[PDB]
């Protein structure tokens with residue numbers, strides 16, 4: 001179902017509408033131009049930013065799902081219509097760990113990274129960092145596995161040493177980690193994304209709750225139960241087979257229009273939790289943004305947010321000359337980073353109460369931006385055409401037109417204008433409000 005080049009295309013009317021629980025699917029050419037390498041240009045540097053793949057529910061959530069499925073089964077006198085599978089369903093999901101399907105998504109990602117940048121990757125060993133989370137590090141290892149599988153099959157590859165994960169960045173309230181958030185005190189106390197997501201759930205779920213209970217005489221459901229049954233559709237699909245070849249029976253319980261609501265619920269939680277809807281959301285992406293400026297311009301980092309000044313000034317942990325960089329982060333920090341880079345500056349603040357599509361929001365949704373296995377590529381290229389370098393940004397293969405600089409028809413800016421137009425992050429935005 002899952003392809004190396006295009007990601008997951010099984011039951012796309014449903015599987016592309018699970019927000020950050022959607023398996024990655026390519027958005028090449030959706031509301032965008034081709035992602036192909038322009039004629040007469042050569043990539044000179046690529047940064048990849050990736051999430052982990054599909055996983056089991058967290059321990060917390062696995063207990064809540066198992067307690068709900070168990071309670072329905074305990075209490076119902078009849079399992080009616082599309083809910084009748086619950087008669088025999090056995091809750092079998094594990095917790096926390098990547099699923100086999102999620103591991104393969106990351107092997108695929110590495111193969112796809114090699115194939116897309118083959119002319120560069122042939123002679124280069126990427127510099128790789130991972131935020132210190134087992135799922136993230138495991139994803140980094142699978143991406144390396146796929147990259148090497150591809151490289152050692154290419155007779156034009158000249159430097160075939162495998163890359164190591166060189167930097168594991170601790171995750172805590174006191175470690176400055178640009179790939180995870182933790183040190184911005186006031187932001188860690190924020191409840192806004194939760195409050196927005198709960199308000200929206202309380203608006204859309206009641207009608208589904210009422211219809212669902214009536215298919216299960218003896219059962220009482222809540223709004224949160226609706227959300228848990230919808231969550232079950234993605235989690236059971238990405239666990240129940242090693243290739244996610246079978247849509248879970250939970251999925252049919254809900255209509256296509258209801259799936260659009262659930263997708264929106266996830267987009268709202270990310271937008272108001274971590275993106276521009278949170279007053280300190282984009283501030284969590286300034287540290288990586290300044291790290292990216294340093295790499296693209298081969299110049300030392302200027303940052304006073306969540307960089308570590310020690311780690312950024314040593315070539316062992318932050319080389320400025322490496323041609324390929326790959327960093328493994330998290331969905332929530334990746335949303336902050338994309339906002340901090342200005343990439344969704346055509347997105348108006350999302351309606352807290354009513355569905356707006358990814359295309360209405362100029363390419364923003366949780367499923368188009370941080371699906372399981374999400375990746376972004378930030379390229380510099382040197383053209384026979386042009387001659388300052390040019391920069392381009394791809395998020396899950398969609399060319400996302402840059403803001404803060406005048407973009408050409410291929411969505412590129414001159415590198416110097418790009419970095420100058422990142423004035424908000426270069427200034428440290430409103431980081432001082434953290435304290």
Ligand SMILES: *[C@@H]1O[C@H](CO)[C@@H](O)[C@H](O)[C@H]1NC(C)=O
Nearest residue numbers: 174175176177308309310311
């Ligand atoms: C910065 O990195 C150094 C060297 O790893 C570490 O000892 C120090 O605790 C880090 N400080 C912060 C605040 O991240």
Ligand SMILES: *[C@@H]1O[C@H](CO)[C@@H](O)[C@H](O)[C@H]1NC(C)=O
Nearest residue numbers: 192193194195196198199352
């Ligand atoms: C949640 O809805 C209440 C009830 O109308 C409203 O007062 C509140 O401002 C909403 N909260 C958020 C964060 O939008």
Ligand SMILES: *[C@@H]1O[C@H](CO)[C@@H](O)[C@H](O)[C@H]1NC(C)=O
Nearest residue numbers: 176304305306307308309310
């Ligand atoms: C860590 O972050 C806090 C700034 O947000 C800062 O005061 C401190 O200097 C930074 N420490 C290091 C080692 O970068």
Ligand SMILES: *[C@@H]1O[C@H](CO)[C@@H](O)[C@H](O)[C@H]1NC(C)=O
Nearest residue numbers: 341342345403404421422424
């Ligand atoms: C995005 O818009 C914000 C809010 O107007 C602005 O502060 C920021 O500089 C913009 N970012 C870019 C890269 O243009």
